[PDB]
Structure 1
């Protein structure tokens, strides 16, 4: 299910920083970004329409860590909702529990947040959840149980939370590690760079 491989090769493959190597350290410049995705990375591709559709889809997926059948299920869930499909798809991607744990700063990277959810530490509404694909309902409160609270791995990785944008749609206590979920995020708030329209183009055919 999980990739567990070259998480920094994917950032060179898409060119943009996928935040898979976020970590305690800052922007690395230790892998020759944008100029070497692989062995023949010096070639300039033709980069057609289906090409940029597939690159955009795999970019959003390796940001969010969602497999293809699971993302197609998210697209099928977002297609039957109201409004428009592109906002609803990214809202369902943000509604994952491990993404909420990542936005709270409870872990440096996304795989660390998925491991923290999976190892019976993340608890929402007094009920412990192991599945990282937990659809977070609005008006919930997420925290860490007392038997797994602050064994230093949440601690220094919380300092990275002092360097992030700290978005509006969720609030962390940062004294007892008790987060608070709020209303759904607007499209003009989440990372301002990814394109949902190419994903709609790919899953429309």
Structure 2
């Protein structure tokens, strides 16, 4: 399933702008509810923060966690979360937000190594090419997010605008990923 609910409530609950920029981040910024903590509370807040910022449900999150444990566990769990089709598409800037990237991947618009992959949880190994569909290179929504913005602030993406593709050089280290997540709390909770 998917959350498909109100996003500003989660944004005001967690304080951080996980989904992006909004006026409610500065106006009326407090946890939701007309009525609005133990270490269990903070650990649950951290785990739910990761889940909401990456669009992952509980069973998939647990599978990711113990896969990272089998193969610092909290350190590489974050890069496992980052290495996802929707997340990589969003970080390449070709889609505005992670939900938009997930919808674009789920629809027939994104190819991996020349073959269209529409599973928005496909792990992307290093040295792989992710590109827009050749039949969808001329969409009105597909171009304003990539062209014009042109952030390119991540030293593990190669963009190559002349082909509309993209490549992942290697898994970034835990310090270079701009996510305010304490993996020690999550690994302690799941331990």
TM-score, normalised on structure 2?
0.93
- Could you tell me how far apart the structure 1 residues matched to 2:178 and 2:28 are? 20
Indicate if the aligned counterparts of 1:170 and 1:182 stay in contact, CA closer than 8 A.
Answer: yes
Give the CA deviation at 1:117.
0.5
Give the CA deviation at 1:201.
1.2
Paired position in structure 2 for 1:44: none
- Could you tell me how far apart the structure 2 residues matched to 1:195 and 1:72 are? 17
Match of 1:125 among 113, 125, 131: 113
**Which one has the bigger helix percentage?**
2
Indicate if the aligned counterparts of 2:157 and 2:166 stay in contact, CA closer than 8 A.
Answer: yes
Paired position in structure 1 for 2:50: 60
- Could you tell me how far apart the structure 2 residues matched to 1:71 and 1:6 are? 21
Q: Which runs of 5+ in 2 are unaligned?
A: none
Matched, 1:39 2:34: yes
Indicate if the aligned counterparts of 2:12 and 2:24 stay in contact, CA closer than 8 A.
Answer: no
Give the CA deviation at 1:146.
1.4
Paired position in structure 1 for 2:67: 77
Alpha carbons of structure 1 residues 88 and 160: separation in structure 2 relative to 1, 3 Å = farther
- The number of aligned residues is 190
- Could you tell me how far apart the structure 1 residues matched to 2:51 and 2:148 are? 23
Matched, 1:30 2:18: no
Give the CA deviation at 1:180.
1.1
Indicate if the aligned counterparts of 1:119 and 1:130 stay in contact, CA closer than 8 A.
Answer: yes
Give the CA deviation at 1:38.
2.5
**Alpha-carbon displacement from aligned partner over 1:11-60 (angstroms, at most 9, x marks no partner):** 111111112xx3xxxx332363533522222xxxxx21000000000001
TM-score, normalised on structure 1?
0.87
Indicate if the aligned counterparts of 2:13 and 2:30 stay in contact, CA closer than 8 A.
Answer: no
Give the CA deviation at 1:8.
1.7
How do 1:40-189 and structure 2 match up within 5 A?
40-41=35-36, 47-81=37-71, 84-159=72-147, 161-162=149-150, 164=151, 166-189=153-176
Alpha carbons of structure 1 residues 62 and 33: separation in structure 2 relative to 1, 3 Å = farther
